[PDB]
Amino acid sequence: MEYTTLAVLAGLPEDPHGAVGLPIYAVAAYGFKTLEEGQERFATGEGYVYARQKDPTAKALEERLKALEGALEAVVLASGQAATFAALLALLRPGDEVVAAKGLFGQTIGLFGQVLSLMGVTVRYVDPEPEAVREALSAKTRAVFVETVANPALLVPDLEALATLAEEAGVALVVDNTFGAAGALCRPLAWGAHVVVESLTKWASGHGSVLGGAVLSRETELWRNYPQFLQPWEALRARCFPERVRTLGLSLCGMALSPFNAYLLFQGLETVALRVARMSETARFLAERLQGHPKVKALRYPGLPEDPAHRNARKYLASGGPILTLDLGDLERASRFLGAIRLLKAANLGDARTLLVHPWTTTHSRLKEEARLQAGVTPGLVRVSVGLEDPLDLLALFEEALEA
Amino acid sequence: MEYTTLAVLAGLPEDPHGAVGLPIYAVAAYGFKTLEEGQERFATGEGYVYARQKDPTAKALEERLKALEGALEAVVLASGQAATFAALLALLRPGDEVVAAKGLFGQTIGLFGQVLSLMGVTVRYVDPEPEAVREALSAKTRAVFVETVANPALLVPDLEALATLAEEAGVALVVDNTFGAAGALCRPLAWGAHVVVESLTKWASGHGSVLGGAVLSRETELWRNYPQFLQPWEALRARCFPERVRTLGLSLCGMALSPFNAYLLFQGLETVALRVARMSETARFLAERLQGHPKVKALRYPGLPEDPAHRNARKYLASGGPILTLDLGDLERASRFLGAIRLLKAANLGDARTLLVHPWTTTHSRLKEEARLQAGVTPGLVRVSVGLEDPLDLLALFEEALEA
Amino acid sequence: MEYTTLAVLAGLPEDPHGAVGLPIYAVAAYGFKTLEEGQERFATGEGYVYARQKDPTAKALEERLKALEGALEAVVLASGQAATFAALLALLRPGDEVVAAKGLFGQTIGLFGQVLSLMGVTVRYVDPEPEAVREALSAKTRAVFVETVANPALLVPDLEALATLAEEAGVALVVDNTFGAAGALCRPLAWGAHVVVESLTKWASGHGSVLGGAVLSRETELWRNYPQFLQPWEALRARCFPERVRTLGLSLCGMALSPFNAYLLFQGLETVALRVARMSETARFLAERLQGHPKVKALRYPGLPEDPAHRNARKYLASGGPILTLDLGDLERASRFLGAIRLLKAANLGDARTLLVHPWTTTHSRLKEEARLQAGVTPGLVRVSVGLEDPLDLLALFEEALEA
Amino acid sequence: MEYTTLAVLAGLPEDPHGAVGLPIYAVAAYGFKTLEEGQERFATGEGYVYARQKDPTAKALEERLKALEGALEAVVLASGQAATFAALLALLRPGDEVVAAKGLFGQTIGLFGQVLSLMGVTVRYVDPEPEAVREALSAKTRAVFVETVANPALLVPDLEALATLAEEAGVALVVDNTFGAAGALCRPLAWGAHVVVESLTKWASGHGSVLGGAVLSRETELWRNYPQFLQPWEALRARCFPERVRTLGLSLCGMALSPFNAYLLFQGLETVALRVARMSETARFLAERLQGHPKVKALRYPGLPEDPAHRNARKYLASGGPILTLDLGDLERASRFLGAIRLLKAANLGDARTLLVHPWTTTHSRLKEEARLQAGVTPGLVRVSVGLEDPLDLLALFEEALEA
């Protein structure tokens, strides 16, 4: 079955009534008829007992995301941040190191700096490229972390070669696939990534409504080489990793996704491939039409022939994707543009509305200047997350704003 | 205003339309009209930008819980577990120690063992009593953690004397007030606790519906003595602690409560004092009527005159409270009782339905035998969370089950 | 089982997972595996096919309301208004007459005037008292409609004697039991009413949140005497009436209650008896303390010894109930009182907040002056729907306002 | 702005916080600070007082549907059925006649037969074609009712010529635009229809989730000629019609849409044009590929060159649309096909899943045989509502089923 097919069918429960959709299990606990039945659900983890460990509505969304990313197993949690955090928490010990791409989401850098520091972990930031990664490896490296498309630098890493290196070094390649849109734009596991994390808040939801995140992994022998699975590997084989994300992330840290949120995210997936296709058509149109404009200092879009991302885009992404950036030259010209444009400015991505933001003063404002510049963030840069609006209507609004 | 008054009025928003209740802000992002407006909301944290940091619906529930616990500030998160974890994460550094009561919730022990170990922290478990705590203090102690009512041991710590000791040692007294029912049964901050954490899933919700948790703190000078607030103390004074729970727990770890869950929890608080009063009336009735029964080896209920908890209950709790336990003598007699009783068995508390559970095989099954016994869990023990049903109907069901 | 017991247990589904609560079936349609299976669900109405006819979440709320009102069958619909309308639509033909109490809810009078006029029906308004009803009967009378407690006149009809008369005349006694709080304060079916309708929006919900209504009926031979059940009586016996409310109200007019609303109403019932008891305790306290105040021209409360409603209250209601009125003497004094009182003014009832309103200018403003006066509405009258707040806090706010 | 643009922007509230989306006003009542403020909101209908009359969440969905259908005003209600019923209730008096197309939705025929009969109205059924309509006019005709695309006969009426005739006769042309997908496939008001009604449950929702309906009208002088607007026309001009649908449908009959449902429908509109385009691309592909198959007796699809609907489709619809039918020849061959096909059978339309149904035994089973045949329903007929799945995957499932 094709992605569009799986997206409306995968994960639908076998409802006793024939229900064509997903009931919302907004219930905290599940009862049992005897001491023994209770004892067996607690011992084996089968059946339900309490919603913080698992819930049938979240399970449907896991099964659908599993089908769409082509994974072994998915675990959903309260947000994208919670998923990045739970995945790393399940991998790492005090004294470990991570080798992380430089271009990362500002809260991933914040989480790495302020929380993984507390778990005793050090991070080395590098260009997400095999040789730079190689030369950062040490005896203590336990994970290589990159994003499918750097945001906002819009660089696409060579995933397959990074996965071969990670596999050869005995470490996990963890890919933040937030920009790959739950597999609709990219499926990093298919190229050899061991773990994907992502914010479902973005493209998967599609409506800038509620928060969710996911961790997914693939069948691999890697986890045999992590001591925490030697104290699970025998019992669970490659499922030992997602079971520990579950245990640590949900049972213990309690980062549980509401079944109301699971239900909305489950439905947003039904149109993700259609939406991402439309946004990316429009983004390529806007890229082509705006790149030669005199007031546009630089336009980055991975599907432009001469773009730096175009090589790796053509291999890993289904299209040029839904994001582009403009450099207006400086703060002053960005300001006038954003003040003039009759489109929303907000810090979200993958909404059905086209959204513009100034990373230097918002998404990346909690970082020092050097760190902004290293992430491809400059004072002229404006990021555009393209929505579902008519491409001619959008171009007219851009043109008009540029007149200001 | 009295608690019952505050519970239906506190935290109601000033709605532009006059709305008597709480709209659900199921929106991810908040837009701005200029580069500069965006930049100012990011710099100052005022106004809204993105739902993972804050949301008007969660804010209403914080303001109500603040009023009800009599706190300086509340922060809500995705679950009780997330709140215990975020509070400790905001307090602790690798190498710190915690001194924790022995009787604790099994997932709090699990979180301490499996996650706080990863943050480099060691825990010393003691009887929650001033001298045992005193003699456990070391140069590295950074927190004393107890529960308002030990579950299921039903012992009530001497909070005021523990708070005086913590204050004198320069460490935080953190109280899990899950059993104090959002201030309706106990307000630990009023006795000098620095921090309360709690599961709103339980009594506050009242319907065994959705998960939520809260962290609250009081005005105190203690945080001046924690280095992390010296790198905040000047800018924020006693609000530095809840601001860091927010930052670490929500911004970074992303343990965000859904606005659908906030809305349901906000409403459950409107009846918590009424429900807790009814449950506790009924629990005292069942305690009195069952304690002399020949098949009941031991009945614990804090409001029974000769109960070990009765001293500290009379001081700290509004009543004997909604929980009691029976010891049937052994596994075999517990089994027959639970199989025979025409009441639900499930692992939840503070639901409107009376719930029974066998801690030895469920809530405490992930602990070694010694740890079960030290928590007051034995193979004969059955815990009862008393709901809203008629007390005579309930007694008849107990009597009848005991015949088996 | 007692009412409080039934309210947390009745209508809980037999969930395949043991769920202790009610999943929300927010699904439009239910599928089938063969042409024949589809054909059989359509023929027999068994199983599910489409949410406008029936839905498992609404069914749970029907079963609980059935248990609580002590009915044969309940049907839920989108609002209290929809239920009054559907019930009458299932009873009446063009040319029929209704004999209706004078004191009625303003929208019931509006529905009777503006919509039942369109269905060809005439209404005779009378004092809700056996002899006045008797003398209004004609060959064309098809229903006697009264409210359990007139609002705001606070008169309680002699239900048992009205039901004996209706039964003797061969016509339905239809009781709006909105004030009887889903059976917690009154159960009209138990006294011989054939049909109850009510707004669940009010006391049953308890949180001034979402709209719902219900129609319920009892086992009776009456429907054999209505021709529409002779074209059903044989097949369904006393269930012919609720089946037709379903068919006309839901299948055809499509007045369907959302499963999100059913879920919230199902939970509000879990505390209705506790809330109604508390409100009514407080209302009796406020009645007693305010009735002798010099600025209070008249105070009506059914549980006051000398009140006109007290006779019939003592027989039919569980207590004096949660509503009282004050007459300030005139418009000018009502105005100052309501402007001065630090309590909410809004047009809703049975919320957890005490609510005040001026019927002459609001709830009854769409009626001519004569009709207001006949409903017990005067320019001095203020209606109080007592909430869950502390009674001393409330009395202080009243006293203080009266100073103005 | 183009339809796709309006669909993500129209109706977004001016939120005090900048919220990019729609808060859910799950609140029953709106308070006021003085007797006078209350009195003025009741007199003028401005501002809010009680959710049965209006609610900010429903208002956003009305404003968006207004923009998308290009209407004067929209009113939302609990279901498609409620909207058809409320619209006619606002138009008609006892003794009026309606002239209605023969091919109609089975519940519209049921509503006409079983409920409009109770309002004293007679219906004449005709081919939805100017001359047949003309010759059915009488002095008593008050409305001509047709559906944008007959279901399942798939005939498209000549709307513009029907609107010219209705306008010339002084009667309303009421169009059920359920198949025109909230204006994405057809906008009947743009061709001169006076009133549109539709089920938002179908294409607008897009997820087979919750029920909603809408009534919309256009600026017209027609309502001056209806006596009920002469007792409103002066005060409100063409808005007198939607104000009366509101008053009768919502204030009085209480057919109110839940704000949870409004919120889900508001979001489903954001992708309706994209979804309808994809479904209709796929439907045309399946039409073309299946029409020559030997086991397919007849295939109807409006976008096939020689189809009977193709003339009027090319004028009124944006494409061939998302529905097609197959005639398998008889009951026995339909049965084998439907039993064999690995696609869902359910009675819903415009879901993201492709749905098949056998109208003779389901959607039209409550009609006599003659009425089925007159609606284009035969024992061989299978209706397909095309979803979002891959067209090659779908064709393979059809081909395979036809082998059976």
Ligand SMILES: *Cc1c(COP(=O)(O)O)cnc(C)c1O
């Ligand atoms: C937004 C985002 C996240 C975080 O997800 P939330 O649900 O917002 O926590 C993580 N990674 C990337 C690339 C993101 O864009």
Ligand SMILES: *Cc1c(COP(=O)(O)O)cnc(C)c1O
């Ligand atoms: C249930 C419970 C928790 C955890 O809360 P969740 O919302 O269930 O995580 C924490 N402490 C105590 C005492 C509890 O009983």
Ligand SMILES: *Cc1c(COP(=O)(O)O)cnc(C)c1O
């Ligand atoms: C409020 C009320 C109604 C109507 O119910 P809604 O859900 O508001 O339509 C009907 N009867 C009485 C007495 C009411 O008070």
Ligand SMILES: *Cc1c(COP(=O)(O)O)cnc(C)c1O
């Ligand atoms: C389904 C449908 C309706 C009714 O809408 P509900 O929301 O299901 O009542 C009305 N007209 C047509 C053509 C329909 O298909």
